[PDB]
């Protein structure tokens, strides 16, 4: 029997319920589940949608959570669902119950801590080749990357690496949404277009350089899609940068041999985001430090120890959780 390798092949909810009978939590798990269920049911009550639609959705979600195979998948996916639900519900928050827009704080922190307005620096001179070079990681690889990371981490990573990936990705995006709602901020194209004056939630967003991309390949793909968005002032912390950093950290954790590639990818994505005038550098750095700390916790916790002689998941015959106490250089005088 190769239990570690194989997924769950049982289909009876009784097993799940008896596991919940058996499982023992700690304060970590108490606050985890209390917080996540809190957000879930808050979204249930809020989020204007027909009550029958919402009841059916949550009932299907529950019966998907409770059946062992789909249970393990979607129960681990839980934080991602919380992120998505809270994001759209927050799109349905009321206009004058959310904080005022800070159009002056991000340029201040950036010019103070990093020299100049780096978005303006990288956008001083633009052309078509650079427009495409920025369009790729912004609009294509950003959206395709979480699923590719899941597939590659599932096959080539050790077992249960994907659980930690789901946990870290979900909590990163959740804290990102919470901090975007707590602290609103106008992205750089706002200073480019209007300048320094004060904003309000009754103005439409703008693409930036994706407008040039739209002109290039003749659609209107992005102008309409942006200019009626609800996260216009949602440019702190970065979520493009946070996601890119999380994906690259997990690639560098699972594949430690071809590592420079992923750092080059992240720098490509940061340049792409500040090229199209969608972020300040402090935005990307809030996102990146958030993702970094989250991943450090999740790696010196939950995540297992990768092996280097083993090809793919189905050749891993053990789960090995990291150990803070032994591994430290500043040991207990073991020799």
């Amino acid at each position: 029997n190769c239990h570690v390798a194989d997924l769950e092949t049982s289909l009876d909810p009784h097993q799940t319920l008896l596991k919940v009978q058996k499982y023992k939590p700690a304060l970590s798990d108490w606050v985890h589940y209390i917080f996540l269920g809190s957000i879930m049911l808050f979204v249930f009550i809020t989020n204007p949608a027909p009550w029958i639609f919402k009841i059916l959705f949550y009932c299907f979600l529950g019966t998907l959570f409770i059946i062992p195979a789909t249970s393990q998948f979607f129960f681990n996916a839980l934080p991602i669902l919380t992120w998505v639900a809270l994001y759209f519900t927050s799109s349905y928050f009321p206009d004058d119950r959310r904080p005022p827009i800070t159009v002056k704080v991000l340029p201040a922190v950036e010019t103070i801590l990093y020299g100049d307005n780096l978005s303006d620096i990288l956008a001083t001179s633009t052309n078509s080749f650079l427009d495409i070079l920025a369009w790729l990681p912004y609009g294509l690889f950003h959206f395709g990357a979480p699923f590719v990371v899941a597939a590659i981490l599932f096959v080539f990573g050790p077992p249960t690496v994907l659980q930690g990936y789901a946990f870290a990705f979900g909590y990163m995006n959740l804290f990102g949404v919470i901090m975007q709602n707590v602290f609103p901020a106008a992205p750089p194209w706002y200073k480019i277009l209007y300048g320094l004056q004060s904003a309000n939630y009754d103005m439409h967003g703008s693409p930036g350089g994706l407008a040039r991309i739209d002109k290039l390949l003749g659609i209107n793909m992005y102008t309409t899609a942006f200019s009626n968005s609800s996260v216009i002032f949602g440019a702190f912390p970065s979520l493009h940068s946070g996601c890119a950093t999380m994906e690259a950290l997990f690639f560098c954790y699972c594949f430690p041999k071809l590592k420079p590639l992923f750092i080059a990818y992240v720098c490509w994505l940061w340049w792409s985001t500040m090229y199209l005038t969608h972020h300040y550098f402090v935005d990307l750095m809030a996102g990146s430090v958030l993702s970094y700390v989250i991943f450090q916790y999740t790696k010196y916790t939950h995540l297992p120890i990768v092996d280097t002689s083993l090809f793919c998941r189905w050749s891993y015959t053990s789960i090995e959780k990291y150990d803070i106490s032994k591994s430290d250089p500043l040991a207990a005088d073991s020799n």
């Binding site: 020299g115 550098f281 970094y292 803070i324």
Partner: protein, 187 residues
């Protein structure tokens, strides 16, 4: 040159060992010098920089290579390397304070009812600016103390105990002198 009390923590906010915090500190620092890398891209793009920003960006890259060495040697110490890192990080802390003052000066020299409520008050914006700048400065100083304490308690041990062109002579002499400095300061 002589002894000094210099009380230092032996944890990051109590709940974590020094070496893991050391890795986190180095990683947090390396990112913020990727910004200097993008300044050297400002070289190509066309934006005209001035000497102060050039100094900041080149110093950023310099310390970026050094702290990259640090991030490589996290799990297996080497007292030369980490002494160099500690003192270079303290010099960079002084430079960060100088540059933050310079650039704040730089910027402050160079700059119905519902809709009224939706826009933040100028006092609020200045408050947030000061909060975020100071949070960065205190976190910088705390990181600096973490590095110092890690080097000290690397010193008081066993194993971790220090004992080609002008390149390698200069770098190895730099590490040896820096170790001497740190040893006198902390031991």
């Amino acid at each position: 040159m002589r002894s000094s009390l210099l009380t230092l923590p032996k944890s990051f906010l109590g709940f974590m060992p020094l070496y893991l915090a050391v890795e986190i500190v180095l990683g947090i620092s390396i990112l913020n010098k990727c910004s200097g890398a993008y300044g050297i891209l400002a070289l190509f793009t066309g934006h005209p920089l001035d000497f102060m920003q050039w100094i900041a960006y080149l110093w950023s890259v310099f310390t970026l290579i050094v702290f990259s060495q640090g991030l490589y040697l996290i799990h297996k110490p080497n007292l030369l390397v980490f002494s160099q890192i500690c003192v270079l990080y303290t010099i960079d802390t002084i430079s960060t304070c100088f540059f933050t003052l310079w650039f704040t000066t730089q910027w402050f020299t160079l700059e119905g009812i519902d809709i009224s409520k939706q826009s933040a008050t100028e006092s609020y914006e200045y408050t947030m600016t000061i909060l975020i700048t100071l949070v960065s400065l205190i976190f910088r100083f705390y990181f600096n103390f973490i590095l110092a304490s890690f080097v000290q308690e690397l010193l008081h041990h066993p194993k971790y105990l220090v004992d080609k062109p002008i390149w390698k002579r200069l770098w190895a002499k730099s590490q040896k002198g820096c170790y001497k400095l740190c040893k006198n300061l902390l031991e």
